[model samples]
Target: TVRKAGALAVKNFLVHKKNKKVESATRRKWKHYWVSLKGCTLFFYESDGRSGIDHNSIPKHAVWVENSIVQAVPEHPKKDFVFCLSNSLGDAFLFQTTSQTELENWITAIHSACATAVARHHHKEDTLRLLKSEIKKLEQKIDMDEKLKKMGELQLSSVTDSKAAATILDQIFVWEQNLEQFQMDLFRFRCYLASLQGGELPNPKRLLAFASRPTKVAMGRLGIFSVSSFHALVAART
Candidate 1:
């Protein structure tokens, strides 16, 4: 349960080991390893880590990134992209990247990972409230818009605390967009079907307006229409 797979990011870095404690200890030195961040833990590996394919390969060290402070060390003697990861124990690990961008990105990702991980651990409610109303807004749009109802409808479970609720809100927004996109496709298809059956075509201006409003899936494009392959396999299949 501690060591999770699916790393957020992995890169080779030179990690410096300072005095393990504030007291007198071995002199500071750097060791090279491939560090992988997954969830709240940083898994260090030798060389390739071959983690993708080598199921048997275990990390040399797996440190918890949770509750650790991250800081950039711009004044380091000769390191290009030096940063510090210090824990509550007052022990600091100096890590160096090859470029400035990498340092910035790594720090940002680490901060986000820590923030999200801590938020979930604490089970905060304020994030849950804003997220709840956001989902509600999307759901309301689905109910009120007749065109959106014709596209895919999703059933979601109870909205939980921080992280899960955030994930739910994200998906709901995408779902709303998906339906809206499908609505456009529906408008275009309606015009096609009307001309095919010799029915009166709607105004070109109206059709063009819908077409101009941009939107994904090849299936979502035509799946809502009754004549599409999706529906052909449905009601009264041949």
Candidate 2:
């Protein structure tokens, strides 16, 4: 049984590392290498399994080239599955194989890679959302705390002494530390989401309005609102 197990394992490993050779279109030339895929990676080999291996992290959403990445003569039929890799400076690596079967196999593998990558990407977003949701509830608490603090500030100074002021102070303390933390957190999250979605710049112009005093407060971060201290301060103005 142990011998049989070892044999099967070696067979699987050999199959996983199948080396199909191909050349890529280069500037007035073609680059040669053995290519294979496993776990959403495209492996390039130079020689003897000792040739330095280079890999590309393939996103599940990376796709078959709908159009050529570079202007070139259109190839013959049976070449429909041309693939697209990461693009930069408005150009991409367009890939093809020497045979119809090879092209189909790589295309199938790439599609699955995109599917899995995108799924895991959402899984990461889900985890991020769990954290964001926790912060959301906390932000709401801070907003309420800020409101309470305002009521304390505007209560004619004699509304009540210890107990009521203590209530406001407690609210202030609760929101103050946590708000600072989550504000930075939501800020980072917003920044991360934008970059993750592909570095599209934020609105660039912040909409600013004066409330009463020159205090630096932002309404919120992206989808979350962070009332400035001044906004809270003037909110209680009679």
User: Which candidate achieves the best lDDT against the true structure?
Assistant: 1
Candidate 2 local Cα displacement, residue 61, angstroms: 34
Pairs of residues at least 3 apart in sequence or in different chains that clash in candidate 1: none
lDDT of 1 by residue, 1-238 (tens): 3232322222222222343213212455577766667787777767565345244667887777664445556766676687765443333466787777677656655544555554576575443343334446555564655343333233234544667756655665665555554443343333333323445433433422322122113224432211111211111111
Question: Each model's TM-score?
Answer: 0.41, 0.28
Report the lDDT tens digits of candidate 2 across residue range 1-238.
0000000000000001113211122333234444544444444444444544334322222212221111111242333434333211112344555445444444444433433444465575453454345447656875775676566556636656678767766665554544444343343333333333433322312312322122233222112122222212222121
RMSD (Å) of each candidate, 1 decimal:
23.3, 19.4
CA shift of 107, model 2, Å = 31
Model 1 superposed RMSD (Cα): 23.3
